[PDB]
Amino acid sequence: GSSGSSGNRLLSKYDPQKEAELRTWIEGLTGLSIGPDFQKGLKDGTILCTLMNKLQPGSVPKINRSMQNWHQLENLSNFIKAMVSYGMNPVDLFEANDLFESGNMTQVQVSLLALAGKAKTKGLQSGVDIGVKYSEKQERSGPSSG
């Protein structure tokens, strides 16, 4: 899977200059448009999904292009769980509400800033990894119990 990864430890933070770096790195990846209201454009969780798909050929199953809550939420929930598989940290993630109800715009910002730095590896040619071993388990299901 992941041949190697430098490993970013950027503690939760916010920057009016970095935000642009993300949308600029994501928009080009999927080729979609976020919009004037970052939080919004992503809120629905339309691009956030595709973004991952680009990096991983098996991250998100499908995206809900509907103007409904449950639908919009599922998107974020789908993307997030997908990040964990990529090789992110249990803290470098963000909750669905964080973006949906702007419950947190700092956690979502860093998340991307951390997922990108690692994704880049795809492009730039890399060699022998540092030397870390990690592997978590997981399973997907249709009708969630609760």
Side-chain angles (χ1 to χ4, degrees):
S2 195
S3 201
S5 289
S6 195
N8 276 31
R9 65 151 86 162
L10 298 173
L11 294 81
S12 174
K13 65 90 76 88
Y14 204 105
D15 209 311
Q17 86 187 42
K18 296 285 270 286
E19 173 271 316
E21 300 203 328
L22 295 172
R23 59 154 271 158
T24 307
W25 159 76
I26 305 174
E27 273 193 75
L29 270 154
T30 73
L32 300 163
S33 309
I34 299 152
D37 300 299
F38 192 59
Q39 188 270 284
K40 307 281 182 288
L42 310 173
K43 187 202 163 180
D44 41 63
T46 47
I47 301 150
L48 278 186
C49 286
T50 48
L51 167 64
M52 195 66 220
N53 269 304
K54 303 292 153 296
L55 313 175
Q56 166 149 242
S59 30
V60 178
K62 210 72 202 280
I63 300 158
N64 307 335
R65 210 87 61 76
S66 303
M67 199 171 156
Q68 309 210 88
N69 291 35
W70 39 72
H71 278 155
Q72 280 182 56
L73 270 293
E74 191 69 281
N75 289 344
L76 290 186
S77 295
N78 284 336
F79 168 50
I80 301 155
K81 64 179 287 270
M83 290 203 282
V84 178
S85 174
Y86 207 61
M88 300 209 77
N89 270 38
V91 40
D92 286 30
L93 306 166
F94 72 95
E95 281 59 85
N97 324 293
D98 284 343
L99 195 67
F100 195 62
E101 308 209 85
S102 66
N104 210 340
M105 270 269 73
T106 86
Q107 208 72 86
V108 178
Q109 191 150 329
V110 295
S111 208
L112 309 176
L113 283 168
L115 161 86
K118 173 151 90 84
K120 275 272 175 68
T121 183
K122 301 288 154 90
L124 72 88
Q125 270 200 85
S126 287
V128 178
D129 51 44
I130 302 157
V132 174
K133 206 273 270 163
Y134 64 118
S135 287
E136 81 286 300
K137 197 150 286 180
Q138 60 270 120
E139 184 74 298
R140 60 161 181 76
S141 60
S144 75
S145 198

